[PDB]
Design a protein around this nucleic acid. Structure first.
Length: 72
DNA sequence: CCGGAGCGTTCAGCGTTCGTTTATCTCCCCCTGGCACTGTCATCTCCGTCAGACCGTCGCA
């Protein structure tokens, strides 16, 4: 239990469980520039709270492709 | 005026007690072997390095 002071008294010692900054689950779209390609490349990713992640990179060599956990 | 008795010290007969062993008797530890309805493919990893190089590898040309 947390006391009225906001602390956990565990093993006779006073601890605090701080909040954690993380990325919010959802879709995320990014744009980048490659010197070799001389063109812009866009990417999308769907990061969940618990499950696996999937990505979609468009026009690496003017083809759009999917990354299912970056396997093949 | 030596002589004897009492006293001090020092050894040989057998008589008991120790110092160190030995095999037998309980209690425990430790390893190999038995179980007979059937039961025949797990497991979660890993992401918001990072920075570029070194290198071999590999399919396209």
């Amino acid at each position: 239990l947390m006391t009225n002071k906001g602390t956990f008294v565990i093993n006779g010692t006073e601890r605090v469980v701080v909040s954690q900054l993380v990325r919010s689950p959802g879709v995320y779209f990014d744009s980048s520039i490659d010197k070799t390609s001389d063109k812009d490349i866009f990417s999308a990713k769907i990061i969940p709270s618990r499950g696996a992640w999937l990505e979609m990179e468009i026009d690496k060599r003017d083809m759009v492709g999917v990354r299912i956990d970056r396997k093949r």
